[PDB]
Amino acid sequence: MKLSDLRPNPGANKRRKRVGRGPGSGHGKTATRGHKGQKSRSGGLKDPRRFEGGRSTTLMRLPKRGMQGQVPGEIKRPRYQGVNLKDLARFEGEVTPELLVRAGLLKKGYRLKILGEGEAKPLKVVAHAFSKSALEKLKAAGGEPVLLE
Amino acid sequence: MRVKMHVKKGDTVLVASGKYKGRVGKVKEVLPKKYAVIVEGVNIVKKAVRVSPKYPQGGFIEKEAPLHASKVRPICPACGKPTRVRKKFLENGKKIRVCAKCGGALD
Amino acid sequence: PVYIPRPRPPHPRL
C-alpha cells in the first residue's frame, strides 16, 4: 500500500456548491437567490428564527412561568444525580460515588442517588440517597445500602 | 564582507568547460565584483574600434573575454594536475592554499 | 479630470 493507493471512500469528500459561475452550472447569474428581495441582498433578512415581519412574534406572545432568578444569582444547594441499579450490573464488591465518577456514570459535584430501574445485585452500595424502590429491591437481593452524608 | 575566490591573479589555471575546455593559462586578472577571471590566451573576441587616436585605420582588435570563475581550476605547481584548493595552516599560524591531489602548496 | 463641468439644467417638465 503506497501513497498512490490512499483513497477516501465514496462520499467522504464531496465537492462544494460554487454559485454564480455560468449558465451551464445551473447556478449562474442570481447565484440561486432569485430576484430582488431583502433576502437576495448581501446581509439577507433578520434572524428568521424570531423575526415575523413586524408583527408580535409567536415566541413573545407566550407567557413566562416560574422563578427566573435574581442577583446574586443561583443559590448553592446540594445537587443529586441518580443512577439505576441496572447501571451497577458491572461492578462487584463495593460501589461509592467516587467509584462511579470514573465509570462515566455520575458527574462530579453531584450527590449520588440510586434508582429503581434494573435489578439489585448483592452489593455494598454507598450513596447519599435511595428511592423507595431501589431501597426495597436492594435489601431483598442481599445488598447493603449505606446512607452516608 | 568579501567575495570568495578559490583562484588569484598570476597562478596557472585550467579552463574546465566551455569552448576553451582543456586550455591552460595564467590568470591575467580577477574581477571579484563580477565573480570572473581573465585567463591569458582564452576567450578571445572581436571588438570593433572607431578610427581615433591610438586606433588609426580603425577596424577590429582582439580582447580576452571574462570567464565565470567557476570554470577555472588551479594547476598544482608540484604534481602538475588540476585540483580543488584545500586550506592548510602553518606553524607560523598563517593559512595557505594547498593542492588536494598531492599535498603541495599553490600560494 | 478632477474638474467636472456641471450639467445643464433640465427643461422644466412640471
Binding site: 500500500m1 503506497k2 501513497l3 490512499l6 | - | -
Partner: protein, 49 residues
C-alpha cells in the same frame, strides 16, 4: 534508537530515518519496506497497546 546508525543512513536517497518515538503512517506508507530495532519494535508494541 541508535543515534550512530541513523547518522550513517540519513544521506542515502532511498532511506528515511526515524526514531521509534516518531513512527508515523505517512513515513511507513511513503516507503516500500520497514526496518526496526528489536528495541524499537518494543516501542511500537507499547504505543498500540
Amino acid at each position: 534508537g541508535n543515534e550512530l546508525v541513523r547518522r550513517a543512513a540519513r544521506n542515502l536517497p532511498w532511506v528515511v530515518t526515524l526514531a521509534p518515538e516518531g513512527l508515523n503512517v505517512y513515513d511507513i506508507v511513503r516507503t516500500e519496506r520497514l526496518v526496526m530495532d528489536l528495541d524499537a519494535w518494543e516501542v511500537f508494541q507499547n504505543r498500540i497497546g
